[PDB]
Design a protein around this ligand. Structure first.
Ligand SMILES: CCCCCCCCCCCCCCCCCC(=O)OC[C@H](COP(=O)([O-])OCC(O)COP(=O)([O-])OC[C@@H](COC(=O)CCCCCCCCCCCCCCCCC)OC(=O)CCCCCCCCCCCCCCCCC)OC(=O)CCCCCCCCCCCCCCCCC
Ligand SMILES: CCCCCCCCCCCCCCCCCC(=O)OC[C@H](COP(=O)([O-])OCC(O)COP(=O)([O-])OC[C@@H](COC(=O)CCCCCCCCCCCCCCCCC)OC(=O)CCCCCCCCCCCCCCCCC)OC(=O)CCCCCCCCCCCCCCCCC
Ligand SMILES: CCCCCCCCCCCCCCCCCC(=O)OC[C@H](COP(=O)([O-])OCC(O)COP(=O)([O-])OC[C@@H](COC(=O)CCCCCCCCCCCCCCCCC)OC(=O)CCCCCCCCCCCCCCCCC)OC(=O)CCCCCCCCCCCCCCCCC
Ligand SMILES: CCCCCCCCCCCCCCCCCC(=O)OC[C@H](COP(=O)([O-])OCC[N+](C)(C)C)OC(=O)CCCCCCCCCCCCCCCCC
Ligand SMILES: COC1=C(OC)C(=O)C(C/C=C(\C)CC/C=C(\C)CC/C=C(\C)CC/C=C(\C)CC/C=C(\C)CC/C=C(\C)CC/C=C(/C)CCC=C(C)C)=C(C)C1=O
Lengths: 150, 61, 99, 50, 209, 65, 145
């Protein structure tokens, strides 16, 4: 699960990463991002079906150049997918991921967001060889912005 | 000390088209991610030792 | 004495195969968790350490770097000069070097 | 080494007592039989592979 | 004859005059020397290497035309052009692909041209003077970070030791013989003055700063 | 082996005494299918070396690069 | 260019012996035909080099994407995969511990070590210790193998 999130902390627009969230919730987020293309592809079919049913059965658009008839179906195809993506996110999903990110650290700038799977760590002999971020080349700390609340 | 340091086995690639069993078997193998465990000695390949179970076909002379 | 002579301290099992000589198995070898399991296990440790283990860190690193010196008289000097007048035994307990 | 001319491999059974429990008249009884089987292995091979 | 030989002749025009007009027609060893090094067009001047390339180029190129000039596998699928039953149509593009790969024959020749060689074992044997090494030599290594970071660290700290070293020598010059022999001395030492002698206080024997 | 501190009497690998010998691979298909010579180019540096670049990405962000 | 002739022998008449004077020309005639091909290929080769120059700017951006990644934390350059099973991995680890515990017999030459007969004459009488028979050799953590 390698996904960068953009959350709204009131007026602020903050950023985080799914790797900074417990694995129990990374699955719920990944499952949401996995249903988007099925809502996108599903909407492209309707926009393609409804458009093809109109440019042919309606004897007002059928009496037009094929290029105009093909542009309507093409425009209605991708447009039907964008509408489905909005209804998917705006309905209850865009607010659900924010709830799933409750407790995760956030940052003001996307460039400050680390990927936990990309950080350097070592096995601390003084702590039963547990993995530690506080390696012998560390100086100051991490100092994120705040914990997300929703 | 020199003999001891020399027995610490080196890393030898698993990829092999010279042994016909691997030339066939490796076409069906799935390369899975080897997640770093914090070490510099992860034996994610075979080892350059004659007694290794995946390197015994190699002639160390 | 034979040139290809080695003394091994742990058990090994050799393959009884023609034209080949190698170690096919180790007695009582237990397979630990997979690389993907230890990865997830470590991500949980690094995550909590990233969120809850970064305050008051600059002081502990100075103590750790002071204790890596050769002589004790330099450690005491490092603590008094860099760590704001810390005590030798009081810092060793924070780092976990005291019994 | 019994088939070598002026062998220097003195450690390979040259200075050891080497008897056997096979039929005697080795070159008349045993050694031909090894060549007889050889001719069978190769004739059986040619007939098969061809 | 080729342009490069003609360039030699223009440059060797005066040399040709000395050897051919004067020396070559004299008698004695001077003549034998001139007639031997006579300048002109080359006897047996052909270049076999250039001729070898021309032959192998023409021979290998005729092979390219045969291997590349094949009936299409795609057109044989509809059963409407020239091919109804072609049970080995799936072999049509094997030789063309094999010939196209031959363009990388020399670009990828040997081990070093197929990978990053410094990460392979042979590279080490070459840097050790084509000397055999144990197979685990790529692992038994000291950190490159330490070697380069410590080289800077040591020099950066020597600059700060030079300054401290100056203040110590300065402060010690204003010290009495009693102090510079009792301070930092062993407790069991009983100080006994020495006869005063003239010993200059020179920081750097060489006239350096 | 000589430079490493082991003087060598004689030469070659045809050990006259109590040692195992390793003759060259018989140039026949039977042994050419079971054995193959060690390719030195297959002995590599462990890719874990590349995980040290993680330090570089972190220092660059710490310095504001 | 004119070639100096020592005039040691008279050259054959070109009219009576013409074949003797032909090889030189046909050789240059061959080279001229090759030059016609070099010039005719100016646009084909140039179009390739022009494509290499354009492809160079896309490769630069792909290298940074491969090394740094999306947000400057590391890309696929940090990825490493394997075909070893879980048993193959823990076999190799135990193979490392075994070679760490694989020693050779007899150690080094005792004659290259300090003598006890010499320490006596130097002023130190060594104390004879017994063998430690209770220690068991073990391998360190995997990070040190
Ligand atoms: C960078 C940009 C990149 C953009 C990329 C994306 C955009 C690309 C756009 C691509 C589309 C461009 C073309 C569209 C413009 C066409 C305009 C037009 O004039 O056409 C009418 C025109 C009519 O000609 P006319 O004689 O002049 O008309 C005079 C009268 O109108 C004639 O009078 P009439 O009464 O006889 O009417 C005849 C008319 C009748 O027209 C109709 O009545 C419309 C009926 C269409 C029904 C389609 C839905 C079928 C399913 C219904 C199921 C319902 C029952 C069961 C329900 C169970 C539910 C589980 O004929 C038809 O048009 C029917 C053709 C049926 C096509 C069926 C194709 C099915 C594909 C299914 C998969 C769709 C996947 C979408 C992908 C989305 C996700 C990626 O005919 C054509 O031009 C044919 C064009 C070629 C057909 C295009 C369709 C696709 C063909 C290739 C197959 C690809 C399918 C996808 C497969 C992918 C899966 C792996
Ligand atoms: C008034 C009466 C006065 C006379 C009365 C008395 C007459 C004399 C009575 C005899 C008394 C007993 C003799 C004792 C002294 C023996 C001294 C001696 O040197 O023996 C060494 C000799 C070797 O033994 P050894 O060195 O002590 O080693 C001990 C173990 O063998 C070691 O164990 P192993 O298992 O490790 O050994 C392997 C085993 C291997 O296993 C075998 O035994 C191989 C058997 C395969 C062949 C068997 C068939 C032979 C007969 C085929 C002919 C059939 C014809 C009719 C067919 C009709 C079909 C219904 O043995 C051998 O390898 C032996 C190889 C050396 C012999 C092969 C080369 C011989 C050259 C033959 C050329 C003949 C050309 C004519 C030349 C005549 C003048 C020299 O001993 C014998 O072989 C005994 C031979 C007994 C004769 C058997 C019947 C022969 C019939 C031939 C018929 C054709 C001629 C017709 C003549 C008609 C005349 C009327
Ligand atoms: C901004 C850009 C602007 C873009 C727009 C501009 C548009 C300009 C258009 C310019 C024209 C482009 C040229 C192509 C279209 C030309 C129009 C036409 O009609 O062509 C007729 C043209 C006329 O034929 P011809 O002139 O007589 O001779 C043509 C050739 O010289 C020789 O012809 P051939 O037919 O003899 O060659 C056949 C060869 C052609 O070469 C290939 O295409 C290579 C094909 C290799 C892949 C085959 C895939 C097979 C099915 C896989 C299904 C899964 C797919 C999943 C893919 C995932 C990918 C990770 O394919 C084969 O080798 C056939 C056998 C392959 C082995 C079959 C093994 C099947 C069994 C495997 C089973 C294992 C799996 C079992 C699991 C089962 C579980 C259910 O034939 C062609 O198609 C020419 C294509 C040759 C390549 C030209 C490429 C030029 C460079 C363009 C850039 C590269 C783009 C291509 C990328 C393709 C993907 C890698
Ligand atoms: C995302 C994956 C799924 C994608 C969708 C399904 C893909 C199906 C498999 C695609 C394979 C592509 C790679 C192989 C290329 C084919 C190789 C071959 O042999 O083909 C030669 C064939 C030749 O057929 P032929 O009949 O002309 O000649 C062959 C004659 N024999 C068999 C005797 C040799 O040509 C084709 O490519 C046909 C393949 C058609 C598959 C397309 C399916 C969709 C059908 C059109 C849309 C209809 C929608 C409804 C319309 C309603 C009215 C408007
Ligand atoms: C494209 O289609 C194909 C063919 O055509 C049909 C083929 O023939 C072939 C077959 C290939 C061949 C027949 C070629 C065979 C060639 C092979 C194997 C390699 C040949 C190698 C040599 C002849 C040795 C060359 C050695 C040198 C050049 C080094 C000595 C020269 C030096 C150091 C001069 C310095 C050179 C440069 C700076 C390069 C610049 C270039 C120049 C031309 C400058 C020249 C300068 C002067 C002063 C002459 C293929 C594979 C093919 O795909």
């Amino acid at each position: 699960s390698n996904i960068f999130l953009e959350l709204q902390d009131g007026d602020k627009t903050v950023y985080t990463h799914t790797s900074l969230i417990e694995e129990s919730k990374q699955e719920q987020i990944q499952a949401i991002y996995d249903k988007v293309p099925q809502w996108t592809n599903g909407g492209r079919f309707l926009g393609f079906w409804l458009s093809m049913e109109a440019v042919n059965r309606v004897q007002s658009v059928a009496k037009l150049p094929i290029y105009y008839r093909a542009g309507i179906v093409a425009t209605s195809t991708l447009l039907g997918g964008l509408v489905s993506s909005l209804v998917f996110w705006k309905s209850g999903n865009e607010n659900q991921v924010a709830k799933l990110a409750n407790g995760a650290p956030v940052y003001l700038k996307k460039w400050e967001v680390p990927e936990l799977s990309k950080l350097y760590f070592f096995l601390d002999d003084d702590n039963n060889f547990k993995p530690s971020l506080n390696h012998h080349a560390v100086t100051q700390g991490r100092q994120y912005y705040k914990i997300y609340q929703h | 000390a020199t003999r001891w340091y020399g027995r610490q086995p080196g890393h030898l690639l698993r990829a092999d088209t010279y042994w016909i069993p691997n030339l066939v078997s490796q076409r069906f193998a799935k390369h899975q991610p080897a997640h770093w465990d914090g070490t510099q000695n992860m034996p994610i390949f075979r080892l350059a030792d004659p007694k290794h179970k995946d390197s015994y076909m190699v002639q160390f002379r | 004495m034979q040139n290809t002579t080695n003394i091994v301290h742990v058990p090994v099992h050799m393959g009884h195969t023609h034209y080949f000589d190698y170690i096919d198995s180790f007695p009582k070898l237990k397979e630990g968790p997979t690389l993907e399991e230890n990865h997830i296990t470590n991500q949980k440790i690094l995550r909590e350490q990233l969120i809850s283990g970064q305050q008051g860190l600059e002081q502990n690193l100075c103590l750790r770097n002071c204790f890596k010196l050769s002589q004790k008289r330099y450690i005491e000097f490092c603590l008094d000069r860099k760590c704001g007048g810390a005590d030798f035994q009081r810092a060793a307990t924070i780092l976990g070097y005291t019994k | 080494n019994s088939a070598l001319i002026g062998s220097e491999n003195q450690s390979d059974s040259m200075n050891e007592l080497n008897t056997n429990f096979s039929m005697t008249y080795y070159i008349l009884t045993v050694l031909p039989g090894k060549f007889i089987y050889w001719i069978y292995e190769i004739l059986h091979t040619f007939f098969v592979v061809c | 004859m080729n342009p490069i030989q003609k360039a030699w002749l223009k440059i060797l025009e005066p040399v040709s005059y000395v050897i051919n007009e004067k020396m070559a027609k004299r008698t004695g060893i001077i003549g034998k020397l001139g007639r031997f090094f006579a300048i002109g067009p080359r006897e047996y001047g052909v270049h076999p290497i250039n001729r070898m390339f021309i032959f192998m180029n023409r021979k290998y190129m005729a092979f390219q035309a045969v291997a590349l000039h094949r009936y299409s596998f795609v057109k044989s699928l509809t059963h409407n052009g020239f091919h109804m039953l072609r049970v080995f149509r799936h072999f049509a593009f094997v030789l063309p692909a094999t010939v196209l790969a031959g363009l990388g024959l020399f670009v990828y020749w040997g081990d070093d041209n197929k990978c990053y060689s410094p990460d392979r074992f042979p590279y080490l044997k070459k840097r050790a003077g084509d000397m055999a090494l144990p197979l685990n030599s790529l692992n038994q290594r000291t950190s490159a970070h330490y070697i380069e970071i410590n080289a800077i660290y040591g020099a950066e700290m020597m600059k700060r030791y030079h300054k401290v070293w100056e203040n110590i020598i300065e402060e010690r010059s204003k010290a009495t013989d009693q102090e510079k022999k009792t301070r930092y001395a062993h407790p069991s030492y009983q100080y006994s003055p020495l006869p005063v002698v003239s010993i200059p206080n020179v920081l750097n024997p060489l006239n350096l700063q | 082996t000589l430079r490493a501190g082991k003087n060598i009497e004689g030469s070659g690998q045809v050990h006259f005494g109590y040692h195992d010998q390793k003759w060259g691979m018989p140039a026949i298909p039977m042994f050419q299918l079971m054995y193959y010579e060690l390719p030195g180019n297959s002995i590599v540096v462990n890719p874990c070396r590349n995980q040290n670049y993680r330090l570089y990405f972190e220092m660059r962000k710490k310095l504001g690069i | 260019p004119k070639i100096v002739n020592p005039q040691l022998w008279p050259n054959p008449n070109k009219l009576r012996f013409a074949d003797l004077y032909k090889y030189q020309g046909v050789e240059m005639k061959k080279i001229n035909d090759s030059i016609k091909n070099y010039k005719a290929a100016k646009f084909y080769i140039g179009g390739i080099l022009g494509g290499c120059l354009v492809f160079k700017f896309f490769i630069d951006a792909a290298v940074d994407k491969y090394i740094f990644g999306e947000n400057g934390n590391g890309g696929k350059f940090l990825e490493m995969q394997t075909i070893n099973s879980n048993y193959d991995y823990y076999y190799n680890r135990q193979f490392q511990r075994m070679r760490y515990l694989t020693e050779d017999p007899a150690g080094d030459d005792p004659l290259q070590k300090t003598k006890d007969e010499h320490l006596v004459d130097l002023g130190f009488i060594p104390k004879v210790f017994g063998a430690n028979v209770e220690v068991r050799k073990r391998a360190p953590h995997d990070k040190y193998l």
